[PDB]
Amino acid sequence: TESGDTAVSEDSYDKYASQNTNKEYVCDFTDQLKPTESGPKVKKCEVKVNEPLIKVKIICPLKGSVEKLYDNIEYVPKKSPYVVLTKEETKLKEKLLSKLIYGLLISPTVNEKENNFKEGVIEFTLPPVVHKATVFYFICDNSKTEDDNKKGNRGIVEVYVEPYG
């Protein structure tokens, strides 16, 4: 589910566009998910794609990167970006990104580390042409991390691939 175990309504989300520079679209969660007193919040990063050859980069902070602040952080899907979440009617199901987008390139390496969330950053590259509109999701959840009576936040990435080319 989108909001998760957290009781946040959809109007009480914080939504944001990705930082789009030089055909690279970035979701950086590394300060936005720390334990706040108003927590848990939903922090939703929205990646809208209607252009060719966009590299999507998602930066999700690691457990023990800062001490005590990410001690119960989880990311879903564990095999991101190869596996993503899709929202079918009243459900979130894992699906294969190669199946949803034809021509998609996931580099095995990001910055000489593995292209998995356990190295903190995932990354993928969208093809020159897309004929089929697809919406898919990633979760970077810090809302079970508690420090000083403050709860962390639930991060959502929603990628919208519009048809292009």
Partner: antibody
């Protein structure tokens, strides 16, 4: 080159309404985020409101939620703050400011207008 | 809401001296702060965005550093033009975007 010129400031009774404007020039206005930042007399800076380039994202500080609306027209190269239900705490110089974007790391306010004084008094 | 606490409230220095301005955040931050200058009667202008991301027209004597909860703006030798108010600002746990209250840089005599 880059210029931001506000207008619309002045005196209002409490409970009154006012519309501020910021006219832009010297840059492609429809590719930048725009913001309003206020400065009370004797006090520092307080972020009020931000709007993304094509108005898909608006953001407000909590004390002006419900009362203030930010908007923009990219054809007229204009930014607006409509302020209703004005209280004496809204007394400030209001700055329009340009930024590259409103991601989760928000871009710095690289260019500022000259300010418009709003005095809410009986 | 991240509260930023600028320290000291007033710094009293002579030109040519290194100025060290502190900004403390109420929560830890791993993304850098943004610093601004304000001369009296004037709009604020952007000074620095990262370690070295000075704005157009902002000279090299302004540098910025810090992480976690402790952040500093350094003016490596003051010019008479630098005696002004300085504001830090966080941009990464937001909304609300929040500023520090200001440090006034005063000339010592």
């Amino acid at each position: 080159e880059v210029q931001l010129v506000e207008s619309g400031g002045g005196l209002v009774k409490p409970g009154g309404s006012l519309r501020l404007s910021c006219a832009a020039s010297g840059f492609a206005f429809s590719t930048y985020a725009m913001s309003w930042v206020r400065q009370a007399p004797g006090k520092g800076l307080e972020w009020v409101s931000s709007i993304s380039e094509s108005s898909s994202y608006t953001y407000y500080t909590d004390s002006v939620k419900g009362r203030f609306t930010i908007s923009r027209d990219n054809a007229k190269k204009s930014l607006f703050l409509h302020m209703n239900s004005l209280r004496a705490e809204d007394t400030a110089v209001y700055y329009c400011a340009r930024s590259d974007g409103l991601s989760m790391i928000a871009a710095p306010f690289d260019y500022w207008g000259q300010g418009a004084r709003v005095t809410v008094s009986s | 809401e991240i509260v930023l606490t600028q320290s000291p409230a007033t710094l009293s220095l002579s030109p040519g001296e290194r100025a060290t301005l502190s900004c403390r955040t109420s929560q830890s931050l791993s993304i850098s702060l943004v610093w601004y200058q304000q001369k009296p009667g004037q709009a604020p202008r952007l000074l620095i965005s990262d370690a070295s991301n000075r704005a157009p027209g902002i000279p090299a004597r302004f540098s910025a550093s810090g992480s976690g909860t402790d952040f500093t703006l350094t003016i490596s030798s003051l010019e008479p033009e630098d005696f002004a108010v300085y504001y830090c600002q966080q941009r990464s746990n937001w909304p609300p975007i929040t500023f520090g209250q200001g440090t006034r840089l005063e000339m010592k005599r």
